[PDB]
Amino acid sequence: SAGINYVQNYNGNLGDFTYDESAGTFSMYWEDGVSSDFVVGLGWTTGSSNAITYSAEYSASGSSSYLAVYGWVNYPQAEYYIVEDYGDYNPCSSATSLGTVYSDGSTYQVCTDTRTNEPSITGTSTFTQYFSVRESTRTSGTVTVANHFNFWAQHGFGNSDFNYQVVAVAAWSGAGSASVTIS
Template identity: 45%
Template sequence: MVSFSSIALATAAIAGAVALPTNSTESLLARRAGTPSSAGTHSGYYYSWWTDNAGQATYTNLNGGQYSLSWSGNNGNLVGGKGWNPGTASRNINYSGTYQPNGNSYLAIYGWTRSPLIEYYVVESYGSYNPSSAAQKKGTVNCNGANYDILQTTRVNQPSIDGTQTFQQFWSVRNPKKNPGGQISGTVSVSCHFNAWRNVGMNLGSQHNYQIVATEGYFSSGSATITVS
């Protein structure tokens, strides 16, 4: 969560907040309408939904491994999806559906480990922002017939599954990405990525937390309906 780190966008967000007139006819509740953050199990799958409540976002758990998400307002950060808790280092994850971002967004295998605390992404598609542009490239790997850039970043005093922490982010970013804007599907063998990370000195924690197929948005808008298995 909170993976995008553009200083310019953060500055713009602060400026926008300061500029908002106190007598605006648009209420705070209207601007922040949507689904509150939550996590748990639904229809045999684990789900996680997090939002900073800065924009309008609706997350819905559907039957089985399916979920839908729509967001608008070009404001704030959100990430949600379905999968498993705990995750594993050997799962083959299938996803299919529609993914239509407008601006900064990811569609990714997303998860966390502890000991150490690591946030990780296997990015299958993204909107206007390529996460490879703001991370340290460590190598490349071919998994499930596609090439991925391996990257690492550090998050300092940021939200995590253990509160505000400093931790590493591990990335595999598909290159080229799967085109967004409509139907999308694929298979991700997480062991291929985890082994490649380990080979370049990026070691996940010994304790897996959740592992989901997530849609993330940052100061953007869009929609997704994804089925996970």
């Protein structure tokens, strides 16, 4: 419409991935469970601080999984997740804590860590990860991206030179199912 021009499809063939760029809808099924890591979703080839409104039916109980706003910064290279709902794994349990940000009716746990020679948008490289994890989880609403971006910025996040930006469903162990719409 508004406004999808990018499809995220990292190892989506681990499960069952269907999408519609025009409708702004995608679904992902991994009920048989997943052996490896996948990240799928819809969005834009260049991200911004514009708010994202999403609606999703998300079932990832007993699954290391995220329903999240997902994207990259080109340089310095950074990967980010604004996690709205998740399964059994919270990234801020092991990662370096950055504190708390408040956005859109809930506090988010903010944490960071550094991946060395891991799969990236530039093949395989060293990059910083930024996580925002919602305290009281939801599967629909508006993500004020600007709020998270500005908070991360105070901790080294580039806050410019963005690559793609998507509403994504990710999982790397266990079983689940998801269906999403981007307003």
